[PDB]
Write a protein that binds this ligand. Sequence first.
Ligand SMILES: NC(=O)c1ccc[n+]([C@@H]2O[C@H](COP(=O)([O-])OP(=O)(O)OC[C@H]3O[C@@H](n4cnc5c(N)ncnc54)[C@H](OP(=O)(O)O)[C@@H]3O)[C@@H](O)[C@H]2O)c1
Ligand SMILES: Nc1nc(=O)c2nc(CNc3ccc(C(=O)N[C@@H](CCC(=O)O)C(=O)O)cc3)cnc2[nH]1
Ligand SMILES: [Ca+2]
Ligand SMILES: [Ca+2]
Length: 159
Amino acid sequence: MISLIAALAVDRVIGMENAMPWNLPADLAWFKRNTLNKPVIMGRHTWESIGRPLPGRKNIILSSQPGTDDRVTWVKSVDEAIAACGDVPEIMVIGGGRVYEQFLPKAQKLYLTHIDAEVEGDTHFPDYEPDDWESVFSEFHDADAQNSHSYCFEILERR
Ligand SMILES: NC(=O)c1ccc[n+]([C@@H]2O[C@H](COP(=O)([O-])OP(=O)(O)OC[C@H]3O[C@@H](n4cnc5c(N)ncnc54)[C@H](OP(=O)(O)O)[C@@H]3O)[C@@H](O)[C@H]2O)c1
Ligand SMILES: Nc1nc(=O)c2nc(CNc3ccc(C(=O)N[C@@H](CCC(=O)O)C(=O)O)cc3)cnc2[nH]1
Ligand SMILES: [Ca+2]
Ligand SMILES: [Ca+2]
């Protein structure tokens, strides 16, 4: 099974200048709890943004050119990225915008955090069709001393 996981601010904005301009450790914790001990597939810009391998995960990086770090696995196509995950129950796709667009039609489940934050951005999650998905989990949280915006964790499954 292929799943996407992403955090979306207003108007589906997911990044600006190769960074994520919010700070929500509650959402980083959700990300870790949902990805740990799974393979993660990401694009080269997201790799550069994160800046280091994500421990306890098989990191798979898409790039059309040769890899530059043997702490991670580098592949050159969507089909090769999937294959390098081996026979696992769940493959997590962790972005960015260009990678999410390609994996969207292949995926069975979306783990989306909806952040109540107004962000000028230059990267957007794909414009996904409502009718194709069913929401199986949602959980709203107000802002607090650690998390400066409200946020909702949703899980959707493909109908
Ligand atoms: N809010 C969130 O959850 C979230 C999650 C992830 C990322 N982000 C953000 O998203 C932004 C990055 O997104 P992005 O769209 O610019 O970049 P990206 O999708 O992360 O990376 C794009 C790059 O991946 C490689 N790639 C993609 N598809 C490929 C394919 N089919 N075959 C070979 N290589 C392929 C290419 O690398 P080469 O140019 O080397 O060929 C390409 O330029 C950043 O702002 C980041 O902070 C936000
Ligand atoms: N829900 C969600 N939130 C995100 O922030 C997010 N970010 C990306 C890509 N960027 C990032 C940036 C940092 C880390 C990171 O350092 N995570 C650590 C620590 C989590 C924590 O603070 O507890 C990890 O081990 O997962 C992961 C992905 C992809 N999907 C996401 N999905
Ligand atoms: Ca296009
Ligand atoms: Ca915004």
